[PDB]
C-alpha cells in the first residue's frame, strides 16, 4: 500500500476498525442472552432480555452498511478528516442507542433509526465532492490560455 | 482524491449514494409502522402492516451488501459504466419489490430474492475482468518479435 | 483499472466474489423453506426447518459486513495474501456454521458468533499496517 495514500485513509480505517470492534461487542451481548437459557440450538426468542438485545443488535446491523457507505464516500469524495470524525460520533450514538435499547420497561429507544443527522451530513460531503468534481471537470478544464 | 480517479468511480458513487438514500427510505416506512402500532419499545412483531414492512425492509438489508459487492467489483474490475447502470436498475427492482411487499398482499409478491439477474450479471463483469486480467498478466506481455534473429 | 493495482487486490476480489456467491446460496436455501411452507411475512417463530434456516442465514448476513471490513483493511493495510487466505477460511467456517445450523433434530449449532479468530486475526493485520504506517511516517 502506497504510504502516501494510506495516509489519506488511515482515519476512516481507524474509525472503521473501531466500529468493527464495537460491532463484535453488540454481537457478544447477544451471545450472553442466547446463553442464559435454552439458546442451546440458538432459539431466536429467549425473552425480554434476549429479545431486547437481538433486537437492538439487529437494528445496528442494518445501519452498518448504509453508514459505512457515506463514511467513505464522504471520506474520499471529500475531506478524510470531517468524514472520519462524524463517522466517530456515529460510533457514539450507536453505543448510546444500543445501550438504551437494553430494556427494563419504558420506551427503550423505540427507534429502528438513529443518528439520521450524522449519515445525512456524511451524505452531504459525498454529494458535495461528487458535484464539486463535475465543476473541476468542466469550467475546471476549458480555461484556455491561447498565449500564441 | 485524485481528480482523474474520482472520475472513473463517480458513477458507482452516485448509484451508491442513491441506494444509500433509498435505503433510508425503507428504514423510514418501517418507523411509520412501529409508530402507529402504538409500541413502547419495538419488537419485530405486532400487526400485518408493520410485520409486512419490517419484513420487506429486512429482506433488502440482506441484499445491500451482496449487491454492493458486485456493483463495485464489476465497476473496477470492468467498465464503470455498465456496472453503474446495472446497479441503477437494481435500485429500481428494490423499489418495485419493497413496494409490492405489503401493499397488495396478493400471492405473486412474497419472496427473499429480487434481481438475481442483475447481481448475476454484475458478478459476470467482475468475474470478467478478474480473468481477463490474468491474461494481460500472462499473455499481454507476449510478442514473439524477439525471434528477430 | 490500472493493471498493476488490480494485481494487488485480485485476491480479495476473488475471495469476495466467492463469498458473494456463497451468500446467494444461503439466500437460496431460505427460498426453499419459504416455498415448501408458504409465507409473506417471516417474522414469527415458524416452521422449524424454515425457522432454522432463516435464522442461520440472518446470522451470516450480520457477519458479512464486519468481516468484509477487516478482509480489506487487513488486505490493503497489510499483505494482500494472508488477508485473502484468512478471508478464504472464513468462507469455510461460514459454510460449516450455516450447515450445522440446519441438520434436523440433531443439536443444530447455537451461537451466531463465529470464526471469532479469523476476523480477530484479519483485524490484527489491519491494526498492524495501520500502526506500522505511523512509523514510516515518523521514522
Ligand atoms: C477485533 C476483535 C473484536 C478483538 S475479534 C472478535 C472478538 C474479540 C474478543 C477477543 C473475542 C473479545 O473482545 O471478546 N469478539 C468478541 C468480542 C468482540 C468485541 C467485544 Cl466488545 C466483546 C467480545 C468477536 C465476536 C465475534 C466476531 O465475529 C464476527 C461477527 C460475526 C457475526 C456478527 C453478527 C452480528 C454482529 C457482529 C458480528 N460479528 C469476532 C470477534
Ligand atoms: C439523504 C439521507 C442520507 C437519506 S439523510 C436521511 C433522511 C432524510 C430526511 C427525510 C430529511 C430526514 O432525516 O428526516 N432520513 C429520513 C429519510 C431517509 C430516506 C427517506 Cl426516503 C425518507 C426519510 C434518514 C433516515 C435514516 C438515515 O440513516 C440512518 C439509518 C439507520 C439504519 C438503517 C437501516 C436500514 C436502512 C436505512 C437505515 N438508515 C438517514 C436519513
Ligand atoms: C450472482 C449469482 C450469485 C452467481 S446468481 C445467484 C444464485 C445462483 C443461482 C440460483 C444458481 C442462479 O442465480 O441461477 N443464487 C442462488 C444460489 C446461490 C448459490 C448456489 Cl450454489 C445456487 C443458487 C442467488 C441468490 C441471490 C442472488 O441475488 C443476490 C442476493 C439477493 C439477496 C440476498 C439476501 C441474502 C443473501 C444473499 C443475497 N443475494 C443471486 C443469485
Say whether residue C108 is in contact with chain A using an 8 A CB cutoff.
Answer: yes
**Nearest CA among B60, A3, B78 for reference residue C133:** A3
Q: How far apart are CA C91 and CA A144, in angstroms?
A: 54
Determination technique for this PDB entry?
X-ray
Indicate the Cα dihedral angle B41, B44, B47, B53, nearest 10°.
110
DSSP 8-state code for residue B36: H
Ligand 3 mean position, distance from CA C86 (Å): 23
Structural contact between residues A92 and A19, judged by C-beta atoms closer than 8 angstroms: no
Topology of domain A2-148, CATH:
1.20.120
Structural contact between residues B89 and B15, judged by C-beta atoms closer than 8 angstroms: no
Of chain A residues 36-55, which have a CB less than 8 A from chain C? 39-42, 44-45
Cell of C75: 488486505
Resolution (A): 4.2
**Nearest CA among C134, C79, C130, C133 for reference residue A13:** C130
Grid look-up 433509498 returns B22
- B8: CB partners within 8 A, 6+ apart: B80, C1
Q: How far apart are CA C4 and CA C8, in angstroms?
A: 7
Structural contact between residues A70 and A123, judged by C-beta atoms closer than 8 angstroms: yes
- B133: CB partners within 8 A, 6+ apart: B77, C3, C6, C7, C10
Cell of C57: 442465514
> Which of A86, A97, A113 most suits a substitution to test ligand 2, by most atoms within 8 Å of the C-beta?
A113
Domain C2-139: assigned CATH number? 1.20.120.550
Cβ contact, residue pair C20, B55, below 8 Å: no
Cβ contact, residue pair A58, C55, below 8 Å: no
Ligand 1 mean position, distance from CA C63 (Å): 10
**Nearest CA among A40, A32, A30 for reference residue A60:** A30
Grid look-up 417463530 returns C45
Grid look-up 464539486 returns A132
Q: Distance from A46 to chain B by nearest Cα, in Å? A: 13
Q: How far apart are CA A42 and CA C109, in angstroms?
A: 7
Helix pair angle (C63-76, C10-26), 10° resolution: 170
Q: Distance from A42 to chain B by nearest Cα, in Å? A: 17
Residue nearest atom 1 in ligand 3 by C-alpha distance: B120
Q: Ligand 2 in contact with A31 (CB < 6 A)?
A: no
The DSSP code sequence of A55-102 is HHHHHHTTHHHHHHHHHHHHHHSS-HHHHHHHHHHHHHHHHHHHHHTT
Structural contact between residues A29 and A57, judged by C-beta atoms closer than 8 angstroms: yes
Q: Ligand 2 in contact with A119 (CB < 6 A)?
A: yes
Q: How far apart are CA B80 and CA B71, in angstroms?
A: 9
Cβ-Cβ contacts under 8 Å, A90 against chain B? none
Amino acid at each position: 500500500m502506497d504510504q502516501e495514500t494510506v495516509g489519506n485513509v488511515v482515519l476512516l480505517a481507524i474509525v472503521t476498525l473501531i466500529s468493527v470492534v464495537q460491532n463484535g461487542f453488540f454481537a457478544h451481548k447477544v451471545e450472553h442472552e442466547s446463553r442464559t437459557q435454552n439458546g442451546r440450538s440458538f432459539q431466536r426468542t429467549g425473552t425480554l432480555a434476549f429479545e431486547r438485545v437481538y433486537t437492538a443488535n439487529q437494528n445496528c446491523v442494518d445501519a452498518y452498511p448504509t453508514f459505512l457507505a457515506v463514511l467513505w464516500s464522504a471520506g474520499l469524495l471529500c475531506s478524510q478528516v470531517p468524514a472520519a470524525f462524524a463517522g466517530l460520533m456515529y460510533l457514539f450514538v450507536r453505543q448510546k442507542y444500543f445501550v438504551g435499547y437494553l430494556g427494563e420497561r419504558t420506551q427503550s429507544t423505540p427507534g429502528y433509526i438513529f443518528g439520521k443527522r450524522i449519515i445525512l451530513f456524511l451524505f452531504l460531503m459525498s454529494v458535495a465532492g461528487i458535484f464539486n468534481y463535475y465543476l473541476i471537470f468542466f469550467f475546471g478544464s476549458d480555461f484556455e490560455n491561447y498565449i500564441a
